[PDB]
Design a protein around this ligand. Structure first.
Ligand SMILES: CC(=O)N1CCN(C(=O)Cc2ccc(Nc3ncc(F)c(Nc4ccc(C(=O)Nc5ccccc5Cl)cc4)n3)cc2)CC1
Length: 248
């Protein structure tokens, strides 16, 4: 494949490593997404092997709630990734529109995530940074995870900011933060400065608005335990009463 094989549309967003553009395959007129990463920019970060980790990951890993990488190619100065196109966009933007999701919507998202993350883990794959700007939406409103790593302190667990050994439990922490932000509208450790957020995350200082229900409080509080070992398994998250309360 090559750049001349596609019609490029408007950009969809991002900026640091690569922008991601609307694309159309010239032959089929089928819609898909196209990421442009810069080779030199990748070499300075030293993440070139992490880009290869993705290409190797994507040849094995398939899940309805994870974006398919269809293929890849490269010219003299760029690396192009032929991605699946999530036509409803990023969860980040939905959260700005709706300000906050309701329980039934949050519970569905978290289940889709727990199923996704459960699959990833069982094949020795830890996602690093699940956050709203890395979560996309399918045509049926379903959660789709972009990226993995190549991988703001807001979603990082205490082990990572405090420089400790880390596990797949980092993803369980993120899920907790992601659940809180969904329900209340803002992340639980939000502060004015790096120093506060660090302190707050380190010490797990967060509180709940009165409206958050007992069940959601419980699930989130389990996920945001400082001790990673004390956090639940994805099995237990899927079998939590609040999750299985908010499901058909
Ligand atoms: C309601 C409505 O009319 N909408 C929904 C809101 N909306 C959008 O979200 C724009 C939008 C539309 C479609 C996509 N689809 C998609 N396809 C494949 C991809 F690989 C992909 N990857 C991206 C694309 C963009 C971003 C991104 O901008 N993230 C981000 C980074 C920093 C700050 C904020 C954000 Cl959202 C992250 C991942 N995006 C991504 C964005 C415009 C259209």
């Amino acid at each position: 494949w090559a750049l001349e094989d596609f019609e490029i549309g408007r950009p969809l967003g991002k900026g640091k490593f690569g922008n991601v553009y609307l694309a159309r395959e010239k032959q089929s007129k089928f819609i898909l997404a196209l990421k442009v990463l810069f080779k030199a920019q990748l070499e300075k970060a030293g993440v070139e092997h992490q880009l290869r980790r993705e290409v190797e990951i994507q040849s094995h890993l398939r899940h309805p709630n994870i974006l398919r990488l269809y293929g890849y190619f490269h010219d003299a100065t760029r690396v192009y990734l032929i991605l699946e196109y999530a036509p409803l966009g990023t969860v980040y933007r939905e959260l700005q529109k709706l300000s906050k999701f309701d329980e039934q919507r949050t519970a569905t998202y978290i289940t889709e995530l727990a199923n996704a993350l459960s699959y990833c883990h069982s094949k020795r794959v830890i996602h690093r940074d699940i956050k709203p700007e890395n979560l996309l939406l399918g045509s049926a409103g379903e959660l789709k995870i972009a990226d993995f790593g190549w991988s703001t302190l807001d979603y990082l667990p205490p082990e990572m900011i405090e420089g400790r050994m880390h596990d797949e439990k980092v993803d369980l922490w993120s899920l907790g933060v992601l659940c809180y932000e969904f329900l209340v509208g803002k992340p639980p450790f939000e502060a004015n400065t790096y120093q506060e957020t660090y302190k707050r995350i380190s010490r797990v200082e967060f509180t709940f608005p009165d409206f958050v229900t007992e069940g959601a409080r419980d699930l989130i509080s389990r996920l945001l335990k400082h001790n990673p070992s004390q956090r639940p398994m994805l099995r237990e998250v899927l079998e939590h009463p609040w999750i299985t309360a908010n499901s058909s």
